Every structure is written in structure tokens, then in C-alpha cells.
Ligand binder design. Structure first.
Ligand SMILES: C[S@@+](CC[C@H](N)C(=O)[O-])C[C@H]1O[C@@H](n2cnc3c(N)ncnc32)[C@H](O)[C@@H]1O
Ligand SMILES: [Zn+2]
Ligand SMILES: [Zn+2]
Ligand SMILES: [Zn+2]
Lengths: 219, 97, 82, 110, 103, 98, 86, 109, 95
DNA sequence: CCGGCACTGGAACAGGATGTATATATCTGACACGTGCCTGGAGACTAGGGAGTAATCCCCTTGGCGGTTAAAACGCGGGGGACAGCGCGTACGTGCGTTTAAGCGGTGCTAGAGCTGTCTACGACCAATTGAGCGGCCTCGGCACCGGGATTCTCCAGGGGATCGGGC
DNA sequence: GCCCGATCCCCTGGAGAATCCCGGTGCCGAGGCCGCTCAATTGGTCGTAGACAGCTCTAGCACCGCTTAAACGCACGTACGCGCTGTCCCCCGCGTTTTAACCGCCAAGGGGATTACTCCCTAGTCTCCAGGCACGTGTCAGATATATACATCCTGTTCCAGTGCCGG
């Protein structure tokens, strides 16, 4: 039984925090052309696919052909909520996705570093055990509390089949989990991650791998 | 102000030759001086080269024939083939009227 | 007032930026002591001639045509200052 | 004089000063005697070579949705035609920047 | 106890391919104006003492020194690639200048 | 076994005899037959003075002999000793002739 | 008009001739495809000079290419040549 | 004339023709009015600059144990001086050969 | 018939005999030193020209032929030739 | 369990055979003078303006001070590109025998470059009258920026119907 | 057997949310309009620079024969390209903290441009005369051609340097 969590499509500030957009005056131009099967595709080279820029639907010379419009077109699988053991509702895919594929984007609540310290020291001490903090930049902290997506709905591991990357679109950063290999359905979905606690460890790393002994705080 | 001395330039001919090619665009104060220096730099080459053609042959006149060879020496392949026609036409148009 | 040491004003990132505008991807650790030796002699072969042209006309101020002429002497023409 | 003054630039059909070119040829110490058809041949060449640059400056200025020329367009206009680039080899234009190019082996490979 | 997660970093060679595409498109100046203006006055105390400059003259040398260095760092790269490398070592600038004719 | 000087020394034994003479090293008639054929495109039925053919041979040889000394530094840069046709182009390109 | 047409006289710059110009320059060992690019480098130097010599001749209304027109055409490209008068 | 001709190149104590350098400046269209201390100053420099390139070619001839100066001696005298090699940078001298030099990496191991 | 052809031969030959008494010089070398002098002459004049024209004057003088030497001759020649010339120009007038 | 009848890798050095200076003769074609004579330098005077020179106004190069925030300096990590070594075989150097144009004496012929005289068309010089061209003044006035009311789209919402565990 | 009091999938009044777009404000940078003055036009006289119809004579192109250096293949074996793998340390990406470039002000004076006046250094014309250019003749400095006298490079035959691996 999932607890009550609010849903939201894209990010949002939560007070003093504010995002910055970008006009079409300095957005980096591509160099491909609307020629073949994959205009600004994945295989065919693209100076924006390489350097971690997501094209804009207008600056492209092809126009309505650049497949590198993902953090906006919102291409996902469905992946109905599955249940795991020892953690919660760890989820299993129901497609046969290839490698280099997109998975849900981590969107939440964006909060100042100083502000974050307060919002965790308020609740943590009252036995809520909040464990959703992921830094993007100094003064940027995406929080998965008040709001969220299918993105908060993830699980740590040590030998995963997906990772956390970092793109930038329209002048602002993004975070999108990707497909590292061609994983079929009937497989658990998880991503390892590195952290740096402010208090102490509370659980030895427990994944189910061969060398996944670890801890919570060590690499 | 003592009504300072005057200064001459190509700033009202560069601007005229613009409107016969692009009847809508404008030009900036900092991209005018570049064309000014451009003309005041391509003038000396074509003058000085004829000033030595007219000396290797023991003469003292700069005719309308030295300028037709200074061009053929200074300008590259396809450029030096239209300027010749421009010149030889704008003098036939002048010698009659 | 006297001066010294001011060649250390061409900092490290100031050379990295001129490099990136050139088109180089990685950079060794000893270019930063070789480029400040290439830049310090190109300047003398120009300031000497600027000072000479100024010394000739009995002035006391390096105007902005002396530099154009000193650079025109060596096939480094400059467009847009006079 | 008696009759009306028809400027010497108008007869030939130019826009450059055929009156002023003559004085500069006469007071520059290039010879002892200057002909009569020299400035008319010299101005009709200084006109063509300015048409040839303003044309390309406009053609490469409208490709950015602007209606005004700035020093960057001049360099982009000249560094791409292989005859103006040869006639203007050792020349440095202020506030011009470089052309866009990266080598072919520095692009990250698969 | 209450920690924070962190995403990956960039594989070496992307914040260096962004700077190229960013700098080959603007037109500003790339050296600090006062530090450059003091070097010019420090050099020129060896030819004639107590001479002044013109605000538009001290900015005439900076538009040439850099168009020189940028054209030299383009011929260093061709040699560094000739030797089957990616890095540019000091023993390339000397070859470039030697062939060109300065030394 | 005709005493077989070890390969790589006869060359070093004439590098130091062609650096002291002053003669010219191309055949006069096969050179003067090339000039009269290149210059047939520009103007028709010319006649060359006899001291304006010997005035081109020096320029041509003093150009090639000074291009090879700049080719022979690239081949050393790349850790070789034999010059190849992918070197001439680098020297010309760096000079600024193409 | 004895202008008996000519064909392929570039192959007169033979192999040992090029090797001698090489040896004078100080090279120890030579590849096998240089003898086809040295000709292509020479036949482009000669034209930029002969064209200018013929232009200097035409302007004077003559028919004999003398030995001062070559000196002028060479001084034109920053390749001054001492020795032959001027 | 009243007195006898006391030529101008002997008042200054030179060797080059002051009477000729002046006319050359005048009939060559370099400027309009030519001064009177110009030819004296220029002929002296022309004399000094040629009073040195021979002083080295002579010293280079006495090493072949000869007496007559030929072109090769001039090239060997010029390519070995750090100032003349900079003033005559782009100039070629007929019949001059090259300057004897060989690399360091090619000598037999 | 064969009008004439002036040169600097009889003066170079006079200069030679002050630095090397017993020495001769062949034709191919006379015909080189000739062009050398006849080349330096025009480089030195053709810049006093442009100096006089920049400063808006009409006369060439010793104050021009000096500044035209510090720009052409590099290094120590520019320090010895200048010392040379201002001896002849001084001695000439005082006569 | 390391050493001993013979046993196998590195080192040394005269000795040969070739190429590179020595000294004698010897001889020839170009270097260094002497001679006449025709230009071009030199010596004196006269007449007109370019540059040395003193005095004046005022533009613009220094000198100093304070606050902001964009950039430079330093130390941790941690993964990727430079330098060393080995092995395999393709390609240029060396020498010898055989085929082909460069090169050196002439000899003939005429095409075109250099000179000389006559003489007509053309650019410098000068005075007079008037229309193009630079300096300054205003105006507009297309371009950046916010109110700003509301317009397709999207929730929060408490409640309208479909539904059940026994209720009677 | 027939029926009821709340209770989960749907439904739209409040709202709400950014946000194409109609519509206020302020620009520093260019764009059109009048006094003002001086370089360009026109009309005439003159004295040369340059075009041209002969005319002599040097030299660049064409032919021929002959003796010999230089280009041309052809076979071999070796010294140098080229491709591949393993160890490693050096140059790149981040987080904190320190500093001095920058924008924007006030204040004092050095020296850069002009301008009116008076002298003295060059352009210029005649006569007058000697330094330098072509011609013609004499003889010696240097280029061959031999004949030695070596100095440089290459390789096979002993001697150290430890010895193959067998053993009792
Ligand atoms: C983000 S929550 C997701 C909960 C549940 N899996 C779901 O889908 O709703 C992940 C939880 O797994 C726990 N976790 C993460 N890594 C773990 C590990 N290595 N061993 C045991 N628990 C772990 C964390 O404490 C955290 O509470
Ligand atoms: Zn693309
Ligand atoms: Zn795109
Ligand atoms: Zn684990």
C-alpha cells in the first residue's frame, strides 16, 4: 500500500528558490541535417548528443525531426508498481528496452543547502527517517517530500543495471536515469549511488549481489 | 570651440553604394571605419605599382594603361577579370559624352 | 614609482582560454612558463618602433597612429583604428 | 565660367569622387605628369571591390534575423571566399573572432 | 544518518569540449585589462623615461598580441597531432617557430 | 664477397661531398625544354633570351634545396629517419603556401 | 610558325636528379613516393613566375623575354635574386 | 671659374660620389625639396656597410690559400654573422652553395 | 653606340685596398656587390620619403636619414653607422 | 648438490682493400693598366616661400576613494593517456652489366632590338565664379522591459450514484 | 426470503496557474535638416614629351657529326616501419576561501593644437673644365693530369666469461 505522495510533472521552486530559462539567442546549435532514418538520432553522431545538451524544438535545422527531445516529450514505460522484499515496493519493468534508453527523470522539490538543513532537522528528530536528498549544485537540493514522481520510487543497490547522469536543458540542469544495457521484463530496476552522511551509518549495505557487503557511508 | 578644422573620408560614398544592393539594412559606426581603412589601403598598392611600371621604361606619365596592368598583377584569378571590364566600359562611356 | 614582477599578471586560466579558442584539448604543465617568454619579446619589437616614431616628432605621448605604423612595418596590418 | 557645372563624376556614371582621386594622384609624389583617363579607370575599380564585400556582408547578416552590420559579419564574409581571403591574407580585423572548427580526431569515439 | 545522494561526474573530456564551442563564437577580450596595462608601462621604461600613453593607444596592442597567440596555438596543434598524440608539449612551439622563421 | 660496404654509409659519404661544390644538378636541355612548354599557354610564339634561362634554374634549385631541409625536421619529430609524402604537406601548410 | 606541339616533358626531371637535390639538403634515407610529388610541387612554382614575366614583357610591346623581367617578377614575391644585374 | 674645382667628396673625406648620390635622390621622385646634408650622410653609411662584408670575405679567402674573391666566399662570410644574417634574411646569392651542416641523430651508431 | 652603363665598381675597388692590400676580386663578385649597394640605397631612401609625408613636410634632411637607419639596421650596426655619419656631416660644413 | 671433461656465448685486434690528400708540371684565358675625349659636375649670383619660433587657449591624461561580486588560488581524488619493450616482414640500399640522349666543335640566316629626325596633340598654369560637403540640432522612433486582465488548460473539491453486511 | 445506512468510482463549482498577447514607459544610438566656406568647374595660351617611317647590325634558332658520361634495369639481403601489451603517474573536475578588477565619483595641471611674423636655406641660369667610360694589349693565378702516401672502414681467429647439465 503506497502512502500519500503528491504528483507533479516538472520541477518547482519552494520559496526563495527560482529557476532560470533560456531564450533563442545563444542556445547551442546542432550541425546535423534532416537526411536519414535518425536525424539527430542516437547512433548517427550529434554534437548535442555527445556533449550532453538536449536540443530545442526550434533551433534544430531539421525542425520536427530531432529525436533528442526527451526531457520534454516524456517517453517512458508503464512498469506497474511491483513489491520487493526487505525494502518496500521495489519495481520490475515490463518491456524489453535496449541499451542507451531513457528512464524516469528525478523531479522533486528544490531547496537551498541552508534551508535543507532546517527541513531535515525539523522532522528527522521526530522519528520520520527522511532519506531523500540529492545535490545538483551549491544552493540546489532536490527534495522528494511534498511532491514527486515515479522517481522518488527508486531503490539503492551495489550492482545495478542503470545509473544517474546529469544533463542541462534550456540553461538549467537536469537529472535522468538511463539504461546502461538491454534489460528485458521480469527484472528488478535499481541504481547504485554514492552519498556522504552528516550523522552515522544505520545499515550495512544489503543488496543481494556477490560483493555487496559494503555499508551506508562507504564505497 | 574654435570651429575645429575639417576631416575628410569616404563615409558618404560607402553609404550610397549600400542602398543599391540592400535597400533595407544599416551599418554601424564601428563597422564604417573598417571599410574606410580598406579603401585607403587598396588605393596605395594600385598607385605605387604603376609608379614603378612607369619608371622601368623611362617615362614620366601615368596613363590609363598602367592601371590596366597593375590590376592584372595585383588581383587574383576571377577578380582580375571583371574589374578590367568595369574600367574599360566606364571610360568609353566618358570619352563620348 | 618603480615597477617589477608584472609578467605574473598573465595568469594560468588566461592562457587556458586563449588555448581553448585555438582548439587544443589537453595541455601540459610547462607551457605556462614558455608562453610568457614568447609574449615578452613580441612586445619589445613593437614598443621600440612606437617610441622611435614618437621621438621623431618631438612629442611626449605615444599616440594611436604610431602603433599602427609600427605594426604596418612588419606585415601585421591592422584594420579599424585609423 | 558661364554655363552650368556638370560634375566630372556624373558623366561617366560612377558614385566615387573622380574630382578628389585626381588631386591625391597629383600630390602624392608618384610621377611628374598625370594623364587624363587615370582617375576614371581608378575609381571604377574602387567601386566594384566595395560592392563585392557589402553584398556578402548582407547575405551573411540576414542569416541571423538581424538588420544591421557589425564587425563580425565582415570577417565571416571574407574568410569564406577563397579570393578575398587571398587578396587579404596578412590583415587583422578588430573585434572579429575566429571561424568555427574542431579537428577530426578529438571528437569522442564510441 | 540523514545523508545526501550525488550523481556522477563528467567523464574527462566534456567540460573541455564545451569551452571550445563556447569561445569560438563570442568576441570579447580574454586578459585582465589593468594587469595588461601595467606590463606595457613596465617594459617601456628602458627606451625613454617619463612618457605617457593614450587610452585608445594602450588598447591597440591588445588587439594584436592575442590575434598572434591564437594563431600560434593553432599551428602547435598540427604538430602535436603529427606525432600521434593529443597533448601539446613545449618541444612543439619551438618547431613551429623554427619552421616559420622567427628563431 | 666484393667488400660490401654496410648499408647506410655511402649516403653519409656523399652528403658531405654535395655540401662543398657549387655546380647545378639538373640537365640543361631537359630543363630548357620544360620552360618553353609551360609558357605556351599565356602568349604565342615567344623567344627567350639566353641569359634568362640560367636565371630560373638558380631560383628553382634554391627553392627545392631549402624545402628539403624543412621536410627533414618533421621526420625527426615523428621519431623516424625516412621522409615520406605526408611530410611535405605539413611543412607547406605551416609555412602558409596552401 | 615552327611550333611542333609538345607532350609530357615534365618526366625529364628524372629520379637521380631529384635524389641529388635531396642529398644536398641533408637527408639520409628516402621513401618511394616522393618522386611523384616533387614534380607536382615544381610545376606550380614555375607558373606563378612565368606568367608575371610574360605580363612584364607584354606591357613593353616586345617579343623577347629578357633577363630583367625575371628579376622583377622574382623581387615581386619577396624572393630577391642577386647576381644577374639590376 | 676663378679657382680650381675642389670636389665635394674630398671636403668630407669620403670615397663614394656625393655628386652622384644627390642627383640620384633628386631625379627619382622620393620627395620635392632635397636638403643639403642628405647626400653627405647617406654616402658615408653606404661606405661603411661595404667596408665590412669585404673585411670578412678576405679573412675567409686566406683559408683556401687563395688570392681572388669569388661568390662562394661571400656566402660563407654572410651565413656566419648574426647581424648580416638578419639584415639579408630573404636574399639569395648566385653560385653560393649551402652552409656545411649535418644532423646529430643520423651519424652511425 | 653602347651609350654607357654606370656602376660602383671603381669605388668598391678603391675601398678594398684599404683593408686588404694584396687581394683581387673577380667579375662575378663585382657584379654582386654592385647589386647589394644598389639595393640598400632604395630601402634607405624609400622610408625617409614616408616619414616626411607622414609629418606633413616636403624636405628630406639629416634628421630624416637618421631615423631611417634606426628602423632598418638591427643591433650594433645601428650604433656604429650612426656614429659614422655624424662625423662626415660635421666635418663637411666646417670648411 | 654445486663443479668439472670438454662446452658455449661475448670481446679484442691486426690486416686488407678502398678512398682521400699530398707535390710537379704546364698552360691558357681573363684581370689590371694606359689612352682620348665627351659629357656632367662645379662656381657665382638672384628671387620667392617653407619652416624655426614666440605666445595663447583648453582638452584630456593622472591621482585618489568606496562598495560589489565575478574571478583566481588551493587541496582531494581517481581514472586515462604517454613511454617502454617485442616481434614480424615489407621495402629501399648496393653493385654490375647494358642501352640512350646530353654535350662539344662548327656553319648559315635572318628576325627583331636599338638609333635618329620631324612634328603634331596634350597636360601644366592661372584667373574667375558658385554649388558640394562637414559640423551641429533636433526630433522621431523602432526596440527592450512590465502591468495586466483572462484566456485553454489544469487541478482541489465535497458530494451524486453503484455497492454491501446482515437487518426484519 | 425482500430491504437499509453509510461507503468507493465518478463529476464539475472554486480556483488557479502561467502566460499567448494587448498595451504602457524609457532609450542611447542612429536619422533627416539649416548656416557656412573653399575645393572643383570652365575658359585660354604654351611648350615640351611622345608617336612614327627609315635604317644599321647583333644574336637566338636550326642543322650536322661524333665520342663518352650518365640513366636504366636486375637480383639479394638487411635495417627499419609497424602493430600490440602491460605498468603508472599526471592532468582534469569540485568545494571553500581569499583578493583586487570595476564602476562611478571629485580634483588639479601638463602639454597638445593653432596663429601671426620675419629670415634664410633651396630651385634656378650660365660658363668653365676634369673624373670616368670604352678600347686595346700583356702575362700570371688557377684549373687539369699523374704519382705516391697514407687514413678510414670491415671481418675472421683466438682468449676471457663463466659452463651444458650430469651426479653419487
Ligand atoms: C527510496 S526508499 C524506496 C522504498 C520502496 N522500495 C518503494 O519502492 O517504495 C529505499 C529504501 O531502501 C533502503 N535501502 C537502501 N539501500 C539499502 C541497502 N543497501 N540495504 C537495506 N536497505 C536499503 C533505504 O533505507 C530506503 O528506506
Ligand atoms: Zn544532431
Ligand atoms: Zn536537434
Ligand atoms: Zn549490498
Amino acid at each position: 500500500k503506497p502512502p500519500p505522495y503528491k504528483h507533479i510533472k516538472v520541477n518547482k521552486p519552494y520559496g526563495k528558490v527560482q529557476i532560470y530559462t533560456a531564450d533563442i539567442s545563444e542556445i547551442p546549435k546542432c550541425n546535423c541535417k534532416p537526411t536519414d532514418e535518425n536525424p539527430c538520432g542516437f547512433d548517427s553522431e550529434c554534437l548535442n548528443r555527445m556533449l550532453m545538451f538536449e536540443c530545442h524544438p526550434q533551433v534544430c535545422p531539421a525542425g520536427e525531426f530531432c529525436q533528442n527531445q526527451c526531457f520534454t516529450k516524456r517517453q517512458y514505460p508503464e512498469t506497474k508498481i511491483i513489491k520487493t522484499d526487505g525494502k518496500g515496493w521495489g519495481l520490475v519493468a515490463k518491456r524489453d528496452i535496449r541499451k542507451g534508453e531513457f528512464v524516469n527523470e528525478y523531479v522533486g522539490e528544490l531547496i537551498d543547502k541552508e534551508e535543507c538543513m532546517a527541513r531535515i532537522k525539523h522532522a528527522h528528530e521526530n522519528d520520520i527517517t527522511h532519506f531523500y536528498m540529492l545535490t545538483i549544485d551549491k544552493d540546489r537540493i532536490i527534495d522528494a517530500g511534498p511532491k514527486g514522481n515515479y522517481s522518488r520510487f527508486m531503490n539503492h543497490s551495489c550492482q545495478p543495471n542503470c545509473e544517474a547522469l546529469k544533463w542541462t536543458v534550456n540553461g538549467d540542469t537536469r537529472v535522468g536515469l538511463f539504461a546502461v544495457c538491454d534489460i528485458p521484463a521480469g527484472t528488478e530496476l535499481t541504481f547504485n549511488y554514492n552519498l556522504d552522511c552528516l550523522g552515522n551509518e544505520k545499515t550495512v549495505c544489503r543488496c543481494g549481489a556477490s560483493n555487496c557487503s559494503g555499508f551506508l557511508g562507504d564505497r | 570651440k574654435r570651429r575645429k578644422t575639417r576631416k575628410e573620408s569616404y563615409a558618404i560614398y560607402v553609404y550610397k553604394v549600400l542602398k543599391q544592393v540592400h535597400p533595407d539594412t544599416g551599418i554601424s559606426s564601428k563597422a564604417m571605419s573598417i571599410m574606410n581603412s580598406f579603401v585607403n589601403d587598396v588605393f596605395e598598392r594600385i598607385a605605387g605599382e604603376a609608379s614603378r611600371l612607369a619608371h622601368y621604361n623611362k617615362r614620366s606619365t601615368i596613363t590609363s594603361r598602367e592601371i590596366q596592368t597593375a590590376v592584372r598583377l595585383l588581383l587574383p584569378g576571377e577578380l582580375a577579370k571583371h574589374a578590367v571590364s568595369e574600367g574599360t566600359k566606364a571610360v568609353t562611356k566618358y570619352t563620348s559624352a | 614609482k618603480v615597477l617589477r614582477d608584472n609578467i605574473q599578471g598573465i595568469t594560468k586560466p588566461a592562457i587556458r582560454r586563449l588555448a581553448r579558442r585555438g582548439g587544443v584539448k589537453r595541455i601540459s604543465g610547462l607551457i605556462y612558463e614558455e608562453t610568457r617568454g614568447v609574449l615578452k619579446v613580441f612586445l619589445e619589437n613593437v614598443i621600440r618602433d612606437a617610441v622611435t616614431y614618437t621621438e621623431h616628432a618631438k612629442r611626449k605621448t605615444v599616440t594611436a597612429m604610431d602603433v599602427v605604423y609600427a605594426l604596418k612595418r612588419q606585415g601585421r596590418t591592422l584594420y579599424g583604428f585609423g | 565660367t558661364r554655363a552650368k557645372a556638370k560634375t566630372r563624376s556624373s558623366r561617366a556614371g560612377l558614385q566615387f569622387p573622380v574630382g578628389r582621386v585626381h588631386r591625391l594622384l597629383r600630390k602624392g609624389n608618384y610621377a611628374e605628369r598625370v594623364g587624363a583617363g587615370a582617375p576614371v579607370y581608378l575609381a571604377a575599380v574602387l567601386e566594384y571591390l566595395t560592392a563585392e564585400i557589402l553584398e556578402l556582408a548582407g547575405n551573411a547578416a540576414r542569416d541571423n534575423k538581424k538588420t544591421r552590420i557589425i564587425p563580425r559579419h565582415l570577417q565571416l564574409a571574407v574568410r569564406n571566399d577563397e579570393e578575398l581571403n587571398k587578396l587579404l591574407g596578412r590583415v587583422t580585423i578588430a573585434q572579429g573572432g575566429v571561424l568555427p572548427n574542431i579537428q577530426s580526431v578529438l571528437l569522442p569515439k564510441k | 544518518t540523514g545523508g545526501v545522494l550525488k550523481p556522477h561526474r563528467y567523464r574527462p573530456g566534456t567540460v573541455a569540449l564545451r569551452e571550445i564551442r563556447r569561445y569560438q563564437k563570442s568576441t570579447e577580450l580574454l586578459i585582465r585589462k589593468l594587469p595588461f596595462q601595467r606590463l606595457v608601462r613596465e617594459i617601456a621604461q628602458d627606451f625613454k623615461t617619463d612618457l605617457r600613453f593614450q587610452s585608445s593607444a594602450v588598447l591597440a596592442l591588445q588587439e594584436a598580441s592575442e590575434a598572434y597567440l591564437v594563431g600560434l596555438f593553432e599551428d602547435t596543434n598540427l604538430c602535436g597531432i603529427h606525432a600521434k598524440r593529443v597533448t601539446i608539449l613545449p618541444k612543439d612551439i619551438q618547431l613551429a617557430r623554427r619552421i616559420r622563421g622567427e628563431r
